From Swiss-Prot, chain A:
Quaternary state and interactors: The mitochondrial prohibitin complex consists of two subunits (PHB1 and PHB2), assembled into a membrane-associated ring-shaped supercomplex of approximately 1 mDa. Interacts with ESR1, HDAC1 and HDAC5. Interacts with ZNF703. Interacts with STOML2. Interacts with ARFGEF3. Interacts with SPHK2. Interacts with COX4I1; the interaction associates PHB2 with COX. Interacts with MAP1LC3B (membrane-bound form LC3-II); the interaction is direct and upon mitochondrial depolarization and proteasome-dependent outer membrane rupture. Interacts with IGFBP6 (via C-terminal domain). Interacts with CLPB. (Microbial infection) Interacts with SARS coronavirus/SARS-CoV nsp2 protein.
Induction of expression: Expression increases approximately 3-fold upon entry into G1 phase compared to other phases of the cell cycle. Also induced following inhibition of mitochondrial protein synthesis by thiamphenicol.
Tissue-by-tissue expression: Expressed in myoblasts.
Record note on domains: LC3-interaction region (LIR) is required for interaction with MAP1LC3B/LC3-II and for Parkin-mediated mitophagy.
Localisation per UniProt entry: Mitochondrion inner membrane; Cytoplasm; Nucleus; Cell membrane
Post-translation changes: Phosphorylated. Tyrosine phosphorylation is indirectly stimulated by IGFBP6.
Residues modified to Phosphotyrosine: Y53
Family assignment from sequence similarity: Belongs to the prohibitin family.
Full-length numbering of the shown residues: 76 to 150 of 299
Name of the protein in question: Prohibitin-2
Species per Swiss-Prot/TrEMBL record: Homo sapiens
Stretches the record annotates as LC3-interaction region: 46-49
Curated annotation (Swiss-Prot), chain B:
One annotated GO biological process: positive regulation of gene expression
Cell compartment(s), UniProt: Mitochondrion inner membrane; Nucleus; Cytoplasm; Cell membrane
Complex and partners: The mitochondrial prohibitin complex consists of two subunits (PHB1 and PHB2), assembled into a membrane-associated ring-shaped supercomplex of approximately 1 mDa. Interacts with STOML2. Interacts with MAP1LC3B (membrane-bound form LC3-II); the interaction requires PHB2 and takes place upon Parkin-mediated mitochondrial damage. Interacts with STAT3 (unphosphorylated or phosphorylated at 'Ser-727'). Interacts with CLPB. Interacts with CD86 (via cytoplasmic domain); the interactions increases after priming with CD40.
Similarity-based family: Belongs to the prohibitin family.
Organism: Homo sapiens (Human)
Induction: Expression increases approximately 3-fold upon entry into G1 phase compared with other phases of the cell cycle. Also induced following inhibition of mitochondrial protein synthesis by thiamphenicol.
A GO MF label: histone deacetylase binding
PTM-bearing positions, type N6-succinyllysine: K66
Coiled coil: 41-68
Tissue-specific expression: Widely expressed in different tissues.
Annotated gene: PHB1
Name assigned to this protein: Prohibitin 1
Function: Protein with pleiotropic attributes mediated in a cell-compartment- and tissue-specific manner, which include the plasma membrane-associated cell signaling functions, mitochondrial chaperone, and transcriptional co-regulator of transcription factors in the nucleus. Plays a role in adipose tissue and glucose homeostasis in a sex-specific manner. Contributes to pulmonary vascular remodeling by accelerating proliferation of pulmonary arterial smooth muscle cells. In the mitochondria, together with PHB2, forms large ring complexes (prohibitin complexes) in the inner mitochondrial membrane (IMM) and functions as a chaperone protein that stabilizes mitochondrial respiratory enzymes and maintains mitochondrial integrity in the IMM, which is required for mitochondrial morphogenesis, neuronal survival, and normal lifespan. The prohibitin complex, with DNAJC19, regulates cardiolipin remodeling and the protein turnover of OMA1 in a cardiolipin-binding manner. Regulates mitochondrial respiration activity playing a role in cellular aging.
Length: 75, 68
């Protein structure tokens, strides 16, 4: 057992997005995502998501979200 | 503009093509997310100038009131 001390305690995140909105106005939207790590399913996190799981996960999913939904929303 | 309006369809069909191409390399693709999208600024600038001209028309309307 290699351990590494995985923090099942929360660790937050924040990501932004410049969207071409419905009026094609450049809408810069910020979005604070609170993603936390699991205990009895630590695996997918620790190794191949890496110790830096949250960093590997959140950024461009937030980008897609904001751009899709803000291209859908006017100013 | 299809990448702004049809983001989700592009993402899904990219997902299908990328899954079938990654199958030949032994990597199963769980999610396929189109995330980055940007375009020329001067287009938005011209749109804003167009809106400015509309608001100038509104100002001229209030000045029409002024002018009666």
């Amino acid at each position: 057992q290699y351990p590494i001390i995985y923090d099942i305690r929360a660790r937050p995140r924040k990501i932004s997005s410049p969207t071409g909105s419905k009026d094609l106005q450049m809408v810069n939207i910020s979005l604070r995502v609170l993603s936390r790590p699991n205990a009895q399913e630590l695996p997918s996190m620790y190794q191949r998501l890496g110790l830096d799981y949250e960093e590997r996960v959140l950024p461009s999913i937030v980008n897609e979200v904001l751009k899709s939904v803000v291209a859908k929303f006017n100013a | 503009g299809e990448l702004i309006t049809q983001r989700e369809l592009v993402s899904r069909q990219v997902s299908d093509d990328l899954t079938e191409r990654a199958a030949t390399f032994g990597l199963i693709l769980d999610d396929v997310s189109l995330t980055h999208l940007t375009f020329g600024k001067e287009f938005t600038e011209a749109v804003e100038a167009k809106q400015v001209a509309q608001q100038e028309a509104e100002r001229a309307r209030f000045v029409v009131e002024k002018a009666e």
